[PDB]
Amino acid sequence: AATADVYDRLVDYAIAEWGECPRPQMADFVEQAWAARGHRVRRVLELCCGTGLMTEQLVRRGYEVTAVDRSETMLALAKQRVGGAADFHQIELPAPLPDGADAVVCTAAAFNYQASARSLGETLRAVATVLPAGATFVFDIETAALLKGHWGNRVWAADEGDLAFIWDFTSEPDTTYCDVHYTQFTRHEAGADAYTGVREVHRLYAFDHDTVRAQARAAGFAQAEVFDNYTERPATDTTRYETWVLTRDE
């Protein structure tokens, strides 16, 4: 992997080009969601923390954050971003999760990497086991309108001098997913033309509302509220990023 600057500039690109929600607004929404529903939240468990952009917001707002991610490299960058002011663990979902938290969050569409509705339901079960009755789990997912409709088979690319990258999307009409080929070139030194090339490839899956509710209900979240990209707006046909608020059974 590379520096937090690279991943931060990819997030910058997603915000400007595709409408991804900035992390300060994300945390504003989850805090308002907790307040409006009267939840007492002091300890927060964050799934798939990455470089810790949401972890920085949660820590800055005074919460006792526990953050997990399957990459030791991501956990290293996140610990540096927040100065170690959170307990980090290395876990890959679905798997047993830490306990003792009042609320759980999972931002930046990590759930779109889940292969099947089964793997989705398994992750929700992993969260439900470590959630007290009546407590909340907030995550986001990208919709088919974004994966198939907007990204589709188009290409995005940017040359920022020290960093250049290519997003290559492929989408079949008869599927619920799309494949992303990511290519990245980072400059060695400012006074040279040497670059390191790195590539990643992932399949991004879409889950319709009927599936999300069935898996949440089966996992112990009979109550599920969905909103349009960290606002009070309801999700509609043109919604690209859905924010789900799940409430543990009692």
Ligand X SMILES: Nc1ncnc2c1ncn2[C@@H]1O[C@H](CSCC[C@H](N)C(=O)O)[C@@H](O)[C@H]1O
Binding residues for S-adenosyl-L-homocysteine: 7, 23, 69-70, 92-93, 107
Q: CA 207 to CA 152: how far, in whole Å? A: 16
Instruction: Round to whole Å and give the CA distance between 31 and 9.
Output: 26
CA dist 241 and 212 (Å) reads: 14
Beta bridge partners of 68: 89
Nearer to its own copies, 200 or 210 (CB): 200
**What is the Cα–Cα distance from 86 to 66, expressed in whole angstroms?**
6
Which residues are at the interface with its own copies (CB under 8 A)? 155-159, 164, 166, 168, 181, 183, 185, 187, 193-199
Beta bridge partners of 224: 246
Nearer Cβ to its own copies (159/232): 159
Residue with smaller CB distance to ligand X, 11 or 222: 11
DSSP 8-state class, residue 181: E
121 binds, among its own copies, ligand X, none (CB under 5 to 8 A by kind): none
State the nearest-atom distance from the C-beta of 34 to ligand X, in Å: 17
CB of 55 to its own copies, least distance (A): 30
The nearer residue to its own copies, 15 or 218, going by C-beta atoms, is: 15
Provide the binding-site residues for ligand X, judged by CB under 6 A: 11, 23, 48-50, 53-54, 69-71, 74, 92-93, 107-108, 110, 113
H-assigned helices in 47-116:
53-60, 72-81
